[model samples]
Every structure is written in structure tokens, then in C-alpha cells.
Target chain A: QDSLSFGFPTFPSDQKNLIFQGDAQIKNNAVQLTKTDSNGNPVASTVGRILFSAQVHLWEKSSSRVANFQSQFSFSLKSPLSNGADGIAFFIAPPDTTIPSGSGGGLLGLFAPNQVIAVEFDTFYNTWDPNYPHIGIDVNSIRSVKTVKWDRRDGQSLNVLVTFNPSTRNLDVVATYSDGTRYEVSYEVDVRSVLPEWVRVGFSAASGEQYQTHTLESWSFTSTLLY
Target chain B: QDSLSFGFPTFPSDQKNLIFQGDAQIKNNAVQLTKTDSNGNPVASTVGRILFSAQVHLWEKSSSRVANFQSQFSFSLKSPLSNGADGIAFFIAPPDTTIPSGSGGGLLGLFAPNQVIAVEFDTFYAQDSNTWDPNYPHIGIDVNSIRSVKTVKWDRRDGQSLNVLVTFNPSTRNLDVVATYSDGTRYEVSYEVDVRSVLPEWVRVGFSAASGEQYQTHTLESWSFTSTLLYT
Candidate 1:
């Protein structure tokens, strides 16, 4: 079978094949993707990331064939402040992508000079964002090509499914809250135009002057290259 | 750790530590809990079950200490028939429980002679007012009887996987349930019942599905269960 799949029902204590940067830490079998104070409150102006260490084969360069992939994860965000700043993203970036300096807050810790594709679950409103909490598809820049309003339910775990269909070049993102409120958004973008054959898949999150604790509970991914 | 937990993000090809009964089969890495014909159509008058092979510790009999448990699973149902005959249920029954004879269709494959606790996703309405079934799709908490003590309307979309979470709190005697469809519609219900009084100290937990004259395929995609004993 020309396919690749991996699942993290709960992170291992050793965090074997995973990479953590900035404030990210494996705590209670979940990835805490932002800083939390000693009192368990979210620390302001913090950013963090946790990613799969290996590079994912996005396509075959010779055949120009793209891979169809699906990723599902569960996450939760909570803030003491009424308006939670920043948000979290499931991102696919260049293999050499690094934590961009000064890229915290509304940038979602994913502002890179290189090519990147992200499905952002944004909580705070910025000049570029719509008026409410939202889910957005961002390519290369923070401004989302497609956006949909998301109902913000504090401290509730949400399940997100992201699927990419190579034939249609359509990337669809669906986010479901614990209480069943769902928001779906999609954008058609050819990966060959934005990313290389090999890319890194992971999560990025940030907190601004106002902050929220972001936690990634579980994740699983599968990809198949149709020749 | 005084706790037990297991998760199946996706079932393996080997089908380890799982028990299938009647028409249940492992297909495409998911547990198909009811019969589907060669043409991939659901067969009528079918009942099936898939349960964990091992028994679950529900409470400490001597001390009367109950365990607080949480279970989450994903499932989907689709039918060529407009009104789906029956539905699926997540149930906890006595360790010796077996499929009750002639319990198909509206019974949801869970009418055991023994005591049982179930949270059912019922799609069809039965005439019996005591059953408390609504005409539309609904979620119900069934204790011992097919009749549900509490029922709430469910927003179900055919063929779409729905995620369900059921949590039991022994201290408060509350069983809370939430089901979310792939499209994002969610339904929730809670019932207060002392599980210790209704079940033995040890029990078997699993899924059961049935279809009557109207047919529907019920498939379980993934399941995770965790139980922690409370020491007071």
C-alpha cells in the first residue's frame, strides 16, 4: 500500500518522533501549545509549536502527482480575559520552516517568509479577520483566502478534520465543538504552486496581551499518493 | 494507577481483543455492527453486536464504591429506506449478558434479560407511549427497560459519522451524554441514576445495533473508554 499513516491517541511520555519549540510542553499526555503560569493561568504574549518531526511526502516531483491527505485532531482553548487573543493553526510548511522571530499574538506563531498553508481556528478579532471567532484558510500570509464564522465556546474541546483532495485541489476544514456547533470552510489551492514535494505538518499557536491556554489533545493523519 | 483506559483510533487488521456477534464484521478498519449484503445494502431484520472481550470493573462490591467512567465513540448509519427501522446503542450489561432472542428492530439489539444501561440513538418511533420515543431522531438514556427515562431530539444526518461522549459521575449519580454530527449539529442529555443499584460490580460494555423491515447500516468507526475508581 503506497500510503502513510500515524496516530497519537495520547502522547507518549517520551514524545518520541515529535518536535516541540518555545512554550510547547507535553503535560498530562496533551501538548500544551502556549505558556501557562505557575498558577495555571495563561501567560500573556506567548507562542509555541509542536510538530511531527519527519517530513511528509506531499507529492512525487517527477509525476507532478499530489497526495490526498486527511488530518483529525482535538484541541481546546480557554482564557481568563473575555476576549482571547490569537489562536491556533494546523499548518503545513516548507521542510526547513522555523519559528519566526517576533511572530507571536495574532500572527499565530506561523508568520514565515517561506510558503505555508494553514487552517487557522482564530478566536481573537484582528484588522484582517471577520468580526467573530472564525476558521480561515491561510496561504503564505495571515489573511485567509476563505473564512467562516466559528461559535466560540469557552473551555470546550473541539474536534477538527482537515482533508485535501488533489483532484479538486480543494482543502476543506471542519471544526466541531463539544456541544456540536460546527463550522466548515474550504479553499481550492494547488499545493504544487505553494509548497514543495516534501513538507512539514504540525500545529502553531500564540497568545497576545490577552491570552488563552491552548492544548492539543489528540491527532491522527493519513495520506495516499495516487499515481 | 488504579485506573483503566484503552483507545482504538483505528482497529487493526488482526481484530485483537474484540468480540463480534451475529452479523457484526470488521470491514474497512471499522466495526460493522449490522449486516450489509454483497451489494453493500443493509439487510432487513438484522441484529448484531461488537463488545470488548474483557470485563469492565464498574464498582467495588464490598465497599459499594463506584467508578466514574467516560466513553467516546464515532458511528454512522445510512439506509436506502426513508425511515430507518431502528438505531444503535452504547450499552453496559452484566458480564454474562448475551443477545436476547427475538430482540430486533425497535429493540435496538439490547433487550437483554439481565439489567442493562444504555444511551440509545433512536431514529424510529414505536407506538408505546411508555417507551418515550419521539417521531424524529432522538437520544435516550435507557435503564433496564427499553423505555427511556429521558429523551431528547437528535439532529442526525444520514451516512455522516457522529461523535458521541458518555460520562458517568458516581458522586452525583449523573450520566451525561453528547453526540455531534459531522456537519456540527450536537445533541445532549443527562439523567440521574445510581448505576451501582442497577448493575453488578463488573459489567461488559460495547455497542449494539439492529434493523427491522426498514434497513440501515450501523458502523462504529472508533472508540475510547476510561474508568477511574473513586476512593473516598
Candidate 2:
């Protein structure tokens, strides 16, 4: 695929480049990875996620090494009053749709000590966490290189804007809250230096002892991919 | 009413001066003001708190204006994987048995934009500017306003005990505080001032707290206070 982009407004039955795994499925025309059930209790231990099935090349065969792109979407976390558990992450790793195991709850369905660039919306607090309900930049280890308390109102649709600048190699994210407050979170990440020339980029979410739904409301992507 | 104190693991029935209001209650012999709830949800719009009813005079009758006292308590906030919201406070307010209304959540159930001395265990972000209000999750001293007079960054961990002691001496016009965390870490702060000008001769000393957006289980394990009564 040269570039990939799609929003979950309708069932994605014909998309050959989309991969669904674990508890993920199409529901009510949108992607519903885990259900909250009729009574409100979630289906326990759900580790599900979807991704663009193919990897993308950073540049054309004859193009420059620089890569610049941005991705944005809208999503909601329910039961604001509930101490929302688990979370979701947007990431890029060496190509392969194999879900990482033991990535539930605070791990955000992505794990490792290497080869991934992840931006996590974390809802659970692990013992060593300095802040709960935070957004973090994860490199080799899940240990965040940068983190900030998530500022969106609970149970509301929130907008997240992420951009990477090739010249400066800076990654910037802005989480827009329902009340109109924009919290900007950013850090420097040089993809060429840390990751391989080609990579797979997509989303993943998980839940464990405490359950909460993580949805990819909408997504669009533009990048150079070799055939 | 004069002086009073109580420790959890015992019902507070004997002390008529201790008043429970809003969502504050005695659960399993402990002062369980708020719990994350069965569904891990916080009490929506709930501002539960408890306070002692007695109006304690800060000074002896002869001094009239001088106030001296020492108070300490052991408390803990618990929730394994979530951030705790709102907070609790130890306050000295104008004499009254009525629990302050609209004082839950960020106000910690102790309402007063003026005429109150409050040391707050604040865990949420409020729209205010102060010396130590650098970010969310802190402890602050609010004197007559939500704009804290002083604040310090303190992250009280989950299910951990906190030992807090507060003292004031009119002679030196100084207020001192010492807090110890479960991990054996300690922090202290002090201020110099005459509280007589801000608070009346008879003041109701108590503790209150509230929750919104985020939640936790608050338990006051023990409480003790020593003071002198004064009057006009």
C-alpha cells in the first residue's frame, strides 16, 4: 500500500490491508473490540486491537531519508465516574501484526525493551507510575521518556492530534478536551535512527482486572510505501 | 463544647461533638468518607465529610487573642490503579454545627473564601496560581481563599499511611507542620502569623473532603488534638 487511511463510520469488510485480532470485531457498523455487556460489567480480560495490515516505507526508493506525517482521531472513554482502567496506544514497530502478549491494562497492548515507538493513553497506574491517566512516549522500554496527566473530560469524545517534524525530529501531541482546553505534549523522536527503514503503524488496546473500552474513533494516514 | 478527639477502630457515638454529614459515615468502625464504589466509580456529585462540632478557643480566657494548639492524625487514601481526586482538609472555622454546603470536592467540604484556616491534602488541579501550585497533586494551606497561601508537591501513594502533625503558637505567631509518608519520607512547612485577626475567638476545628471526576477510599485511622479554651 502506498498510503493508508480509514475511519470506522462503517463496517470495514472489504479492506484487505486491515487486520483484526484477539477480541476485536465489527459491531454496529463501527469497530467494537470489547462490549460493556447489558449490565455494564465488561467482558473480562479482553486484549484486542486492529492495525493496518501492511508496513509502509519511509520514503520512495529515490526520495530523501526525511519522513513527515500527522495522524488525528476522535474517541471516547465511558463511565467517567469510574476510575477508568486499562487504555490504548498508537504505535509504529518493525512490520508484523502479531499482537504482543502480556500487554494488557497498564501495558496498553504494546510491550518491550526495544524496536517500537509508542504514544500511550494510560488509564491504570502501575506501582512505579508517577501519574495515572497520563499520556506517555514509550521507546525501548514501557518506561516513558515523557509523560503528562491526561486532561480530557471523562466519558466525552476527545480529539487527539499527533505530528512529527522531519527536520527537527520532534514529535508533538495535543489532546483537546471537551471544555476547550488544549494540553500539548511533545518530545523528540528520530524514527530513522531508532527504527528500521520500514515499519507498521496502528493502534492497540487492552484490559485486565479493571476493564474499560478503548476505541479508535477515526484514523487517516499518508506515507510512502514500497510495492 | 470544648476539646475532643477519636481514633477509628472505634465508633464515634460517645463524642456528641463529632458530626457526620453528607456522604461521610462510619464504615467497619473506620471513618470511610468516600470509596471508589463497587463498580470502581466515584460517588457522582457526592461531597461526603466529617468534622468535630465543638468550638475550641485557641487561647486561655485571660489571653483572649492568643491561640495555641497541636493536632495530628493518621490517614490513608486507597485505590490501586487510579488517580485520586479532590482531597481532604483540616480546618479551623468560625463556630457552627452546620456542615458547610457546596464545600465538597475541591473545597474539601470546608467552605470559606474568607475567615478560615485550612491545610488541604489536594490531589486535583484547580484553576489558581500559587507558589507551589506548579501542577496537580499537592498539599496546600488555604487562608481565606482558594488561592493557596502556600503549596508543596506531594504524591500520596495508594493504600499508604500518612502521619500529619500541625501546630500553632500565638506567642511566636508561628504555624508549623510535619508530615511523614509510609515510605519513611518526611516534609515540613511553617508560617508566621496571628490567626486572631482572621478567625474569631471561638473556632470550630474539623476535617472535610470531597470527590469529583476521580475517586479513592478515604480513611482516617486516628485523630488527636490539644487546645486551650478562651472567651470574651
Candidates 1 onward: DockQ, in order: 0.02, 0.00
Which number leads on TM-score? 1
Best by DockQ: 1
Which residue pairs does candidate 1 place in steric collision? none
Model 2 root-mean-square deviation? 26.2
With candidate 1 superimposed using the best TM-score fit, by how many Å does residue A134's alpha carbon deviate from the native? 61
| Tens digit per residue, CA lDDT, model 1, B52-107 | 75466677755566889999999988888778768999999987677898888888
| Residue B217 of model 2, lDDT score | 66
Task: Count the clashes in each prediction.
Answer: 0, 2
How many angstroms is residue A171 displaced in model 2 relative to the true structure, after the best TM-score fit? Answer: 79
Question: What digit string (tens of lDDT, one per residue) describes model 1 on residues A81-144?
Answer: 8898789999998867878988899888998436889998888874344678888888876468
Q: Is the docking of candidate 2 incorrect, acceptable, medium or high quality?
A: incorrect
